[PDB]
Amino acid sequence: QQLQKEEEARKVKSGIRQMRLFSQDECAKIEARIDEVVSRAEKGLYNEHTVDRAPLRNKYFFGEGYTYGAQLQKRGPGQERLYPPGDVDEIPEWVHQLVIQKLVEHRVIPEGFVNSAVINDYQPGGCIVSHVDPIHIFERPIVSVSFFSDSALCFGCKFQFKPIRVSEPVLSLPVRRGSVTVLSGYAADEITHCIRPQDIKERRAVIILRKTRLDAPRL
RNA sequence: GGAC
Ligand SMILES: O=C(O)CCC(=O)C(=O)O
Ligand SMILES: [Mn+2]
């Protein structure tokens, strides 16, 4: 039914906020700090679980990190876990001053909301498989700031492998460098979101800021 | 080049 597809896409749009908030100079300053994050990881200055490496995507966990995918035995809903307290490195002060301060000042999230800053560094062709950020781990909303290039955030995609094949998205949301994305409601809880390899044509980094639940399970 |  045209009525059915229009309703779900309407539901997904309802949970999406997106606006330009960082200028080119401000991205350049933050992107430089992101490059230093990569350098410190390759110098071994970070705790073991702070750095999660994959062929075309690295995750740098600060404040709070999580286990996902192949790191889970008997993967299923509710099987994700936080690392033990103090395991991952602290949120860097430049993340507090440059990124979170602007979000708090521009009323994107309340002050003291963020306790987890995760940086996803995508190499050209990189992706992340369709998923819902664990409801048992993270409070809503989910805030992310994009850097180094423009891309798209797709919703409701189905992944096939060998080779990687992605079905037609329910919604493709262009995310540009310096743009802030806020997910809530249906867009965050009742539909998966992903980024496709065809959307990453250059190196792209995104800083994801969240609040972990009080009852969030740890390892 | 793999979070459902
Ligand atoms: O590249 C993005 O913005 C998506 C990353 C994501 O969904 C996550 O790491 O939870
Ligand atoms: Mn996610």
Residue numbers in the entry: 74 to 292
Sentences from the paper on this structure:
The results support a mechanism involving formation of an m6A hemiaminal intermediate, followed by efficient ALKBH5 catalyzed demethylation, enabled by a proton shuttle network involving Lys132 and Tyr139.
The 2OG ketone oxygen and one of the 2OG C-1 carboxylate oxygens chelate to the metal in a bidentate manner and form a hydrogen bond and electrostatic interactions with the side chains of Asn193 and Arg283, respectively. The crystallographically observed 2OG and NOG binding modes in ALKBH5 when complexed with Mn and an m6A substrate are of the ‘off-line’ mode. In the ALKBH574–292-2OG-substrate complex, the N6-methyl group of m6A is positioned ∼4.0 Å away from the Mn, a substrate-metal distance consistent with a (near) catalytically productive orientation as observed in other structures of 2OG oxygenase enzyme-substrate complexes.
